[PDB]
């Protein structure tokens with residue numbers, strides 16, 4: 001029998017009740033440059049089953065407790081066994097307290113410890129973050145427990161189902177502010193031992209999970225709002241960011257978002273206050289700590305002066321996402337990490353609903369389709385994918401837990417939940433959701449608990465009828481990987497399903513309990529009119545007159561792509577859809593106008609339609625004004641550009657795109673009143689951004705003229721940038737492309753003095769658009785200079801240069817020649833060789849380039865590839881696939897573009 005301290009899952013013999021935790025970060029290093037924090041904790045737990053051992057999590061903590069590593073006491077008049085010994089078991093991250101007798105069921109005990117750890121700059125547990133304010137380097141203390149790092153800050157039963165209340169105290173410099181999940185109990189008091197420090201106590205948390213705890217010590221300031229219900233809302237950030245008003249947009253949307261969710265969930269916001277904090281360089285992006293949500297600065301802050309509309313969209317959606325968790329995930333918590341997909345998938349869906357409430361004119365809900373659905377379908381259409389569900393017994397180690405946080409969990413999770421809400425109807429979904437939250441508040445669940453409550457809602461009504469139980473249907477979408485392609489023969493109305501793979505040659509080896517058959521909800525529109533809903537059952541082939549058409553009619557499936565599948569038709573129906581889009585596109589919902597493009601290109605890749613059919617689906621775009629269908633084409637054609645932009649195909653391709661985008665460019669020229677006023681709503685602003693990008697990058701003279709005019713105007717008056725933030729990336733790039741060292745040196749100067757990261761990012765990227773070899777080479781020479789290009793921006797900059805058709809060989813030579821820099825950037829800065837390799841070899845599509853890459857690999861004699869080890873193998877296999885693709889498609893594609901480029 002294995003010893004319990006050698007198992008990754010905690011015993012169930014002891015359950016926590018409540019903790020007292022006091023933490024004291026030392027923001028001044030110890031002269032050796034080591035930063036530490038000290039702590040003291042008492043955990044009160046109940047004995048469920050007799051046991052003579054206490055096993056609790058502890059990671060990277062040294063104990064200074066008097067005696068053994070802990071002191072153990074009985075609660076009330078309970079007696080306690082004597083401690084035999086305490087030991088740390090590093091592998092399973094445990095503190096183990098061996099007793100001389102057994103704890104008794106029903107009795108409560110209190111275990112006290114004193115400890116200290118490194119306050120490392122490692123974004124894990126209680127950690128430090130360094131940043132600059134003027135000439136002064138600032139250091140703050142903050143937390144990231146997410147998943148399994150609470151145990152890195154204090155000893156605890158660190159599993160999400162083992163909830164408890166927490167009493168947090170922070171001891172900190174008296175001129176800094178201390179924040180935690182809950183409000184402070186009152187004013188801070190001087191630390192008696194040293195009044196230079198103060199003590200801030202926080203109100204008891206509700207019953208909650210360790211991974212959601214947070215505490216922060218900083219010089220940050222806030223903007224505030226009190227909601228009508230008395231809930232205090234604050235946005236926290238660097239004093240200078242606050243002064244500049246960069247926290248205002250976040251403050252603006254937070255109240256409405258919280259209001260939306262309280263109603264959506266039929267459950268009051270469960271906390272007295274809401275803090276959200278913008279942290280510089282928070283690489284985790286954002287973390288839903290209950291009552292104290294952390295964000296990277298560029299995700300929470302917004303500068304109206306320099307930020308584009310896409311920045312606003314990022315802010316409102318990221319906030320909606322994290323605030324969604326304040327109920328779903330935090331109030332009701334999934335019992336184990338194998339069900340992470342339900343938590344993150346749910347939030348990834350409802351972020352659009354919450355954001356839509358804050359910005360109801362933006363049509364934000366549409367963005368899940370390009371943003372999550374088609375994004376995740378790219379990886380879920382591979383033999384190497386995996387089901388949403390994972391058996392709980394297979395997820396044990398911190399590494400295995402971390403593997404749960406991927407594209408499948410977030411984006412496919414969002415897609416299937418959205419599909420579920422749609423086929424149940426939102427009203428029914430919300431009823432089951434409310435029932436679920438009410439039943440399990442302050443407790444833990446599995447995904448089966450949600451299905452059960454949704455089923456209760458279904459069973460309580462008569463309108464919505466399903467072909468099977470909620471669980472049976474959802475099992476098809478969660479227990480097996482991938483998704484079907486739905487193929488329709490409109491001559492007969494025959495309809496079929498099969499597991500969709502982008503590679504028609506790939507072998508699926510992962511077995512499915514369902515033989516890769518799904519139960520599929522299928523909406524349809526015929527001649528622009530909605531039809532009755534249909535369910536495809538667990539059969540490969542079926543027939544229905546809903547999908548049978550006349551010679552002059554057309555049918556289109558999966559309205560607004562609510563269903564997690566792609567659709568193919570017979571060529572006659574395709575041609576009819578094309579005809580409709582050519583004559584009156586308004587008859588087909590905008591999302592489905594995009595779908596036709598997204599799906600057909602994927603179908604071409606899989607050899608289910610000819611590549612010419614996919615290209616034919618872009619023909620209507622000359623009359624398309626809306627964002628998504630254009631985006632679908634640009635996303636689908638980026639690979640074509642990547643493969644052909646150095647070949648004879650490129651001329652006709654650009655000419656075709658110029659032809660398609662010119663009418664849209666002209667449209668916005670008038671609408672925007674000579675480019676003086678942006679379109680009103682988000683989607684139209686996005687359409688303008690893409691139109692200008694497409695026009696300029698494909699050499700439309702009218703766009704080139706606009707870019708030159710604006711950049712010249714800016715150069716004549718640097719302090720007054722005349723270029724609207726929305727268009728900066730294109731205008732900067734195209735103008736630098738047209739100009740020489742005058743434009744380049746001007747932009748370089750602007751970059752070196754840039755205050756905001758987003759503006760700096762745009763400048764770095766645009767500088768790579770120069771068509772002068774000597775400028776691109778001189779630029780490459782700067783990428784490895786920390787004084788000129790930040791280390792964290794180095795590979796990004798090289799990749800931008802590589803993206804330039806002229807910069808391609810320059811960057812590839814630069815990477816090869818300077819590869820002897822791995823022993824300089826791996827132990828002192830990750831650098832990420834994987835991203836560099838992928839970006840520079842992205843274009844490779846010939847046997848000659850394959851030989852060059854194989855020749856580059858021949859430096860195998862030590863030096864390795866570091867974190868990019870075997871990422872080179874991905875480039876080798878990708879090149880082989882590109883070679884095969886170009887050979888198969890070159891002639892057909894060239895002729896199509898010539899044929900349609902006028």
Ligand SMILES: *[C@@H]1O[C@H](CO)[C@@H](O[C@@H]2O[C@H](CO)[C@@H](O[C@@H]3O[C@H](CO)[C@@H](O)[C@H](O)[C@H]3NC(C)=O)[C@H](O)[C@H]2NC(C)=O)[C@H](O)[C@H]1NC(C)=O
Nearest residue numbers: 018019020021041042043044109110111112167168169201
């Ligand atoms: C977890 O932390 C809690 C907050 O500190 C502890 O509860 C507090 O205990 C204090 C004493 O340990 C009480 O303060 C005063 O202590 C003096 C001792 O000399 C007593 O005479 C006073 O009666 C007492 N003050 C009052 C007003 O009664 C705090 O009152 C008390 N705070 C509370 C109950 O909110 C917990 O004891 C601690 N848990 C464990 C297990 O140690």
Ligand SMILES: *[C@@H]1O[C@H](CO)[C@@H](O[C@@H]2O[C@H](CO)[C@@H](O[C@@H]3O[C@H](CO)[C@@H](O)[C@H](O)[C@H]3NC(C)=O)[C@H](O)[C@H]2NC(C)=O)[C@H](O)[C@H]1NC(C)=O
Nearest residue numbers: 032034035036037038060061062063115116117118119120
């Ligand atoms: C938790 O306890 C650990 C073990 O006691 C500490 O790690 C050790 O720190 C020691 C002191 O910094 C290192 O020993 C040597 O100390 C002298 C004088 O300080 C230095 O000149 C030496 O450079 C140093 N040795 C080395 C190899 O650098 C130990 O090496 C080191 N042990 C390790 C890393 O296993 C932790 O510091 C302590 N942590 C906290 C937060 O208290």
Ligand SMILES: *[C@@H]1O[C@H](CO)[C@@H](O[C@@H]2O[C@H](CO)[C@@H](O[C@@H]3O[C@H](CO)[C@@H](O)[C@H](O)[C@H]3NC(C)=O)[C@H](O)[C@H]2NC(C)=O)[C@H](O)[C@H]1NC(C)=O
Nearest residue numbers: 245246247248249250251252253301302303304305307312
């Ligand atoms: C957070 O919410 C605030 C309240 O809704 C917004 O405040 C609005 O800012 C707008 C832009 O600054 C103002 O619109 C116009 O601004 C121009 C230029 O300053 C003025 O000439 C106009 O008079 C003014 N009004 C118009 C066009 O009707 C709004 O006046 C102002 N609204 C209110 C109620 O104060 C913030 O913009 C918003 N913050 C962010 C970052 O979105």
Ligand SMILES: *[C@@H]1O[C@H](CO)[C@@H](O[C@@H]2O[C@H](CO)[C@@H](O)[C@H](O)[C@H]2NC(C)=O)[C@H](O)[C@H]1NC(C)=O
Nearest residue numbers: 017018019020042043044110165166167203204
């Ligand atoms: C954290 O603080 C809370 C609030 O003071 C403590 O809750 C009290 O616990 C004691 C003993 O268990 C009870 O007699 C009181 O009724 C509780 N008060 C409330 C408001 O619930 C809690 O015990 C503290 N946690 C720890 C570990 O001491």
Ligand SMILES: *[C@@H]1O[C@H](CO)[C@@H](O[C@@H]2O[C@H](CO)[C@@H](O)[C@H](O)[C@H]2NC(C)=O)[C@H](O)[C@H]1NC(C)=O
Nearest residue numbers: 027028136137173174175176177218219220239
């Ligand atoms: C809080 O107090 C500390 C300590 O006095 C301040 O830190 C100093 O800041 C000045 C800048 O004015 C630096 O020159 C010193 O090097 C800092 N000293 C140390 C020991 O770090 C800090 O500025 C104060 N912060 C606030 C917000 O009042």
Ligand SMILES: *[C@@H]1O[C@H](CO)[C@@H](O[C@@H]2O[C@H](CO)[C@@H](O)[C@H](O)[C@H]2NC(C)=O)[C@H](O)[C@H]1NC(C)=O
Nearest residue numbers: 261262263264265266267268269430431434435
């Ligand atoms: C949760 O939803 C319930 C049911 O919709 C709400 O209770 C209803 O409130 C309306 C508003 O006037 C009344 O007309 C109904 O009679 C109520 N129904 C029932 C069954 O009580 C409730 O207000 C919501 N609660 C929260 C916290 O959002």
Ligand SMILES: *[C@@H]1O[C@H](CO)[C@@H](O[C@@H]2O[C@H](CO)[C@@H](O)[C@H](O)[C@H]2NC(C)=O)[C@H](O)[C@H]1NC(C)=O
Nearest residue numbers: 015016161162163335440442443444445446449
């Ligand atoms: C995990 O969640 C379950 C509920 O899904 C908790 O079990 C419930 O506990 C409450 C409070 O004691 C009881 O009222 C219910 O009867 C229990 N429901 C069951 C067993 O289905 C369970 O306590 C939670 N686990 C932990 C460690 O707290």
Ligand SMILES: *[C@@H]1O[C@H](CO)[C@@H](O[C@@H]2O[C@H](CO)[C@@H](O)[C@H](O)[C@H]2NC(C)=O)[C@H](O)[C@H]1NC(C)=O
Nearest residue numbers: 488489490491492493494495496541542543570
């Ligand atoms: C549509 O499906 C039907 C049946 O579901 C197919 O018709 C059958 O074709 C087979 C061919 O071997 C015959 O043995 C059966 O007698 C036919 N059944 C009938 C007429 O009821 C038909 O081929 C399918 N059409 C397609 C795929 O276009």
Ligand SMILES: *[C@@H]1O[C@H](CO)[C@@H](O[C@@H]2O[C@H](CO)[C@@H](O)[C@H](O)[C@H]2NC(C)=O)[C@H](O)[C@H]1NC(C)=O
Nearest residue numbers: 363365366523530559560561562589590591592
């Ligand atoms: C498909 O999506 C479109 C939006 O892209 C839906 O149209 C919206 O419908 C709601 C509710 O009727 C209106 O409040 C909006 O004004 C509509 N927006 C636009 C831009 O038209 C449409 O309802 C969806 N179709 C189906 C069948 O669900």
Ligand SMILES: *[C@@H]1O[C@H](CO)[C@@H](O)[C@H](O)[C@H]1NC(C)=O
Nearest residue numbers: 383503504505506507508509
């Ligand atoms: C898949 O299996 C086939 C035989 O069915 C084989 O020819 C082929 O090499 C395998 N792998 C791929 C990637 O096609």
Ligand SMILES: *[C@@H]1O[C@H](CO)[C@@H](O)[C@H](O)[C@H]1NC(C)=O
Nearest residue numbers: 527528583584585586587588
């Ligand atoms: C095009 O279709 C739309 C959507 O039904 C309709 O409102 C409009 O009248 C049609 N326009 C023309 C010119 O046929």
Ligand SMILES: [Zn+2]
Nearest residue numbers: 321325344347
């Ligand atoms: Zn999330």
